[PDB]
RNA sequence: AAACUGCGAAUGGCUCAUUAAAUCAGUUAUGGUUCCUUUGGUCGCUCGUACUUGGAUAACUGUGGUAAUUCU
RNA sequence: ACGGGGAAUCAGGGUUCGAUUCCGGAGAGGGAGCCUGAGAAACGGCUACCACAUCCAAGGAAGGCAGCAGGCGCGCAAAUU
RNA sequence: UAAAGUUGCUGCAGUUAAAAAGCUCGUAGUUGGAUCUCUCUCGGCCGAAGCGUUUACUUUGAAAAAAUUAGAGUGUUCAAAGCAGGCCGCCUGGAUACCGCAGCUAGGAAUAAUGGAAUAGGACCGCGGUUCUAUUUUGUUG
RNA sequence: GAAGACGGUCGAACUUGACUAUCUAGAGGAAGUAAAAGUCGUAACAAGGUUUCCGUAGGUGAACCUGCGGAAGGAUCAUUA
């Protein structure tokens, strides 16, 4: 295939979008942006499939062209804009704010946040490099580069960004005992305290994480996102508090809710 | 050992060998400084490479190569080329219909540095993947271990 | 006895395929001479032009005349003897007419009384022989 | 409207001729490269007519050629 | 013989199929060579030769449905300009 | 394709039904008899470091497209399907399993290969030497 | 700054030879198979009227015969100090 591809088959779209099979052949094909194609949520999917504010794609376009949607404090009129982890979506006309946080089953949940909490976000740091007359530079998972960071900030750390200004306010160092979320793999969406990190030089590093219920699970280092310092998260967690129920206890909970209903 | 056997002048590019020297500091020769690097992954630099005089741009310790990716092992089978050898890797391939294995092998041409002397047909070599060095060579000998009955 | 060691997979596989070549059906299907020699060329049916009507003697224990036709296949020009099944059905066939021929029932092997015959006529002039026999259709003019 | 400029036309659709460690699959590498676009950074960091510079060309108007073209 | 995901059958083990809507590859009658472009050795771009073939006032000009319909041919074998 | 244990790995046959080379040697291949019951340093008792010869094997963990398959929920009027739906604005899904082989990961050490001293080309303690070398020297300089 | 030219490169394709894969026309020659009820005999099955068969060699209308060396699948598991 000469040149880049511009379409996305519906059955070839990422499964966490929860797209059906009979609506069409194609999928929204996220635009290039701060988040990778497989790990993002396009604006149209969120605005139409998730929130049901629009019934068709044309209605999503009509919504976005009145400049009502803001992603991390900036008006975004692109309906296929890739909104990813920890992004803040603000709709002032109706007055709500959402944070894209993975659910326990590895899907972007509709998570409403208070307007006070919509003024900042947390970003994982991807690399630090010195350039241009010895000025340090940070690169985050959100593709934003910040010059003059705190010298203590190292790779795999987490920084709190004020969305209005774009500057760092504080940070969490990657260390055992700090709370984290898994942003990829089998344990995606799970929240727990880092227990141990084993280093394999020349290969991937494995991080062990223990839930609040005592369950343990491993991931790769690139799949770990520091959420809070110690046991306390710096953001609000979704309704499922990051713990994964087995199918048996999920069925028991569903049956109990059914019995208590009515 | 003379190291000038090609039409061009052999020299480690990083080292500068024409630094001005006053006659008061002319005790024979300056003992030309040697460039060498420590390849990671817990591999020791041979003392020969540090104290040698050979010029080998494909040497993992004194040349311009980066060890990355896969680290494998083999048995030396042939040493008839200049600075490169042929090793043999043997394995068993499983067949599921019969639940049984079959013996297979494949040869690999790997670059051998002058820092590994007294390499005989039969010893074990730990090689590491690098960028293409020739048409068929993609590995560099990182470690040599003698055979089970050497002298 | 057969080899049974843990490292004998290659010996077992090679022996199995070599001996597989000694199976009649396997060799017939995989050698390629049968498909080349097959007048139908691997097809289920074929179309041909009736050359002449012929009567074939039934095999010795039973006496009869089997009414067949010599046909020339359109796709390769090979000449074939095909059996016209029911009675009076030979009267539905003329000379130099299109006929659709199928196999006889055993994969290119002669069937029953008729010797050296492995094809039967299914259609005459684009109308089925069964329809003509049962009076459902008449011969086109 | 037209025309100049910019972007796309390298996606999509079709088919399976070629292709036998090739394609492809899983796994790794680019510390060995290129990358329109989106996103963020950078854009008085350089000690050297401006209260705005020059020549065209298309559209358009007019003369046409060829039997004939999305020719000119 | 395009390769996979897969399909039919199957106690267990297996045998056979996978041109065919998802992923990857290749090609645009056959070879070859290029322009532009971030990205083609692109053919619903261009330049030649080979094979076909259209209009011609005989000087010349224009081609590429393995896109959707549709026609011919081939066939046992497949839909609406 | 099953029937076909008529391709036989599971699991077929070779005296007379088709079948063991005329006989022996012999490279590759395949197979191969008993036997052998973790610590010294670093950082806050642990976290670190090697390396125990290396594995095969076994168990775990990670990474592994969706569709299809298995399978949870859900009265499409039922069903093949679909991923919907339910209650009087609320409530709730869109699970899970499986994914050879090879490649990563961490436990086990039966089985099976492989080695560790027999010109001592041995282990451990101390010794002594030989050589080169990094810094202590040292408000500072020197 | 256009046409154009020397040279190089990629290189379709053309001419001339050589080889090769498939299909094929073809006088004749020599077999196999069915249909086959003819002709000559009788080779084999009973000790099949010369026991049969095997390897080799020669000969003969035809089966077959003969020499040499083997087997019992023989018509002898046995033959007497
Ligand atoms: Mg395409
Ligand atoms: Mg790496
Ligand atoms: Mg234009
Ligand atoms: Mg653009
Ligand atoms: Mg373009
Ligand atoms: Mg920019
Ligand atoms: Mg083919
Ligand atoms: Mg195949
Ligand atoms: Mg196919
Ligand atoms: Mg085909
Ligand atoms: Mg495709
Ligand atoms: Mg192409
Ligand atoms: Mg064509
Ligand atoms: Mg082309
Ligand atoms: Mg076309
Ligand atoms: Mg095209
Ligand atoms: Mg068409
Ligand atoms: Mg026809
Ligand atoms: Mg049909
Ligand atoms: Mg079968
Ligand atoms: Mg069976
Ligand atoms: Mg049998
Ligand atoms: Mg026999
Ligand atoms: Mg014998
Ligand atoms: Mg042997
Ligand atoms: Mg043993
Ligand atoms: Mg799958
Ligand atoms: Mg199902
Ligand atoms: Mg595995
Ligand atoms: Mg020119
Ligand atoms: Mg007698
Ligand atoms: Mg007789
Ligand atoms: Mg006799
Ligand atoms: Mg017999």
The string of DSSP letters for A61-78 reads HHHHTTT-EEETTEE---
- Is the Cβ–Cβ distance between B50 and B33 less than 8 Å? no
Chain B residues touching C13 at Cβ < 8 A: 95, 97-98
Task: Report the residue of C9, C10, C14, C15 to disrupt the B interface, i.e. the one with the largest count of B CBs within 10 Å.
Answer: C9
CB-based burial, A54-79: b 16+ in 10 Å, e otherwise: beeeeebeebbeeebbbbbbeebebb
In 3D space, the residue among A100, A137, A85 whose CA is nearest the CA of residue A238 turns out to be: A100
For B1-151, give the CATH class.
mainly beta
Per the listing, tokens 């919509």 go with A118
- A3 CA to E61 C1' in angstroms comes to 36
Residue B127 β-bridge partners: B72, B141
CA distance C9 to B99: 8
Whether B96 and chain C come into contact, CB under 8 Å, resolves to no
DSSP states along B95-118: ETTTTEEEEEEEEEEEE--TTS-S
Q: How many angstroms does the Cα of residue A2 sit away from the middle of ligand 1?
A: 8
Q: Does the A1-116 domain belong in CATH 3.10.290.10?
A: yes
Report CA(C39)–C1'(F50) in Å, whole number.
77
Element (H, E) at B125: strand B124-129
Shortest distance between the Cα of B68 and any Cα of chain A, in A, equals 7
Nearest to A159 by CA among A126, A187, A113: A126
- Per the DSSP assignment, residues forming a β-bridge with A90 are A70, A97
CA distance C12 to chain B (A): 8
Handedness of CA C82, C86, C87, C92 (dihedral sign): negative
Q: Resolution of the coordinates in A? A: 2.6
Question: Distance between CA C141 and CA C41 in Å, rounded?
Answer: 32
Q: Hey, which CATH number is domain A121-171, 1.10.10.60, 2.30.30.140, 3.30.1300.10, 2.40.50.740? A: 2.40.50.740
| C3 Cα–ligand 24 center, Å | 21
Chain B partners of A201 at a C-beta cutoff of 8 Å? 40-42
Cβ neighbors of A206 (< 8 A, separation 6 or more) are A197, A198, A200, A218, A219, A220, A221
- Answer for the pair A162, A169: CB distance below 8 angstroms, yes or no: yes
Please tell me the number of the ligand nearest to residue A32's CA. Answer: 4
Instruction: State the Cα torsion A132-A171-A239-A77 to the nearest 10°.
Output: -20
Cα(A7) to centroid of ligand 1, in Å? 10
Task: Kindly list the residues from chain C whose CB atom is less than 8 angstroms away from the CB atom of residue B93.
Answer: 9
Cα separation, A94 vs A73, whole angstroms: 15
Sort out which chain C residues have CB atoms less than 8 A from B101's CB and list them.
6-7, 9
* B88 phi/psi in degrees, rounded to 5: -115, 130
What CATH number labels A174-244?
2.30.30.30
Cβ-contact C18, C27 below 8 angstroms: no
* H-helix or E-strand spanning residue C81: strand C79-83
Distance CA A111, CA A237 (A): 8
Experimental method: cryo-EM
Sheet strands (E) in A148-205: 158-162, 168-172, 179-182, 191-198
Which residues, 6+ apart, have CB-to-CB distance to C21 below 8 Å? C27
CA–CA dist C44, C32 (Å, integer): 17
| Angstrom distance (rounded) from CA C26 to CA C24 | 6
For chain D, which bases have at least one atom within 7 A of a protein Cβ? 9-12, 28-32, 36-42, 45
The answer for B 6-45 residues in CB contact with C (under 8 A) is none
Domain borders along chain A are: 1-116, 121-171, 174-244
Q: Cβ of C7 and B97 within 8 Å?
A: no
Q: How far apart are CA B44 and CA B143, in angstroms?
A: 9
Residue of A nearest to B66 (CA): A202
Q: Are C121 and C99 in contact (CB under 8 A)?
A: yes
DSSP state of C70: E
């Amino acid at each position: 295939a000469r040149g880049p591809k511009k379409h996305l088959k519906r059955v070839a779209a990422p499964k966490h979008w929860m797209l059906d099979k009979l609506t069409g052949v194609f999928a929204p094909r996220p635009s290039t942006g701060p988040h990778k194609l497989r790990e993002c949520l396009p604006l149209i999917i969120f605005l139409r499939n998730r929130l049901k504010y629009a019934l068709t794609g044309d209605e999503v376009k009509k919504i976005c062209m009145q400049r009502f949607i803001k992603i991390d404090g900036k008006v975004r009129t692109d309906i296929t804009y890739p909104a990813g982890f920890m992004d803040v979506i603000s709709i002032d006309k109706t007055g709500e704010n959402f944070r894209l946080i993975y659910d326990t089953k590895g899907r972007f949940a509709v998570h409403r946040i208070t307007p006070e909490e919509a003024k900042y976000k947390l970003c994982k740091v991807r690399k630090i490099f010195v350039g241009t007359k010895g000025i340090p530079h940070l690169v985050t998972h959100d593709a934003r580069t910040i010059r003059y960071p705190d010298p203590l900030i190292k790779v795999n750390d987490t920084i709190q960004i004020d969305l209005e200004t774009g500057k760092i306010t504080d940070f969490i160092k990657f260390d055992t005992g700090n709370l984290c979320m898994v942003t990829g793999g089998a344990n995606l969406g799970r929240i727990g305290v880092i227990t141990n990190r084993e280093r394999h030089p020349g290969s991937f590093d494995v991080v062990h994480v223990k839930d609040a219920n005592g369950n343990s699970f491993a991931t790769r280092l690139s799949n770990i996102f520091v959420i809070g310092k110690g046991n306390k998260p710096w953001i609000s967690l979704p309704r499922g508090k990051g713990i994964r129920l087995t199918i048996a206890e999920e069925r028991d909970k569903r049956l109990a809710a059914k019995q208590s209903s009515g | 050992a003379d190291i000038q056997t090609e039409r061009a002048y052999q020299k480690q590019p990083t080292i500068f060998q024409n630094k001005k020297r006053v006659l008061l500091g002319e005790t024979g020769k300056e003992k030309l400084p040697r460039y060498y690097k420590n390849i990671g992954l817990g591999f020791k630099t041979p003392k020969e490479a540090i104290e040698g005089t050979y010029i080998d741009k494909k040497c993992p310790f004194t040349g311009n190569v980066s060890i990355r990716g896969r680290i494998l092992s083999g048995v030396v089978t042939k040493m008839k080329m200049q600075r490169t050898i042929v090793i043999r890797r043997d394995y068993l391939h499983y067949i599921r219909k019969y639940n049984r294995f079959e013996k297979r092998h494949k040869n690999m041409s790997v670059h051998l540095s002058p820092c590994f002397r007294d390499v005989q047909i039969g010893d074990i070599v730990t090689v590491g993947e690098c960028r293409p060095l020739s048409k068929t060579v993609r590995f560099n000998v990182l470690k040599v271990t003698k055979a089970a009955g050497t002298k | 006895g057969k080899c049974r060691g843990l490292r004998t997979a290659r010996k077992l596989r090679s022996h199995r395929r070599d001996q597989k070549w000694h199976d009649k059906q396997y060799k017939k299907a995989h050698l390629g001479t049968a498909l080349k020699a097959n007048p139908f060329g691997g097809a289920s049916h074929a179309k041909g032009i009736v050359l002449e009507k012929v009567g074939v003697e039934a095999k010795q224990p039973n006496s009869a005349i089997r009414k067949c036709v010599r046909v020339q296949l359109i796709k390769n020009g090979k000449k074939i003897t095909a059996f016209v099944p029911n009675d009076g059905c030979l009267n539905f066939i003329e000379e130099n007419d299109e006929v659709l021929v199928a196999g006889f029932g055993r994969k290119g092997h002669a069937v029953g009384d008729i010797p050296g015959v492995r094809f039967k006529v299914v259609k005459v002039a684009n109308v089925s022989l069964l329809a003509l026999y049962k009076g459902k259709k008449e011969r086109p003019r």
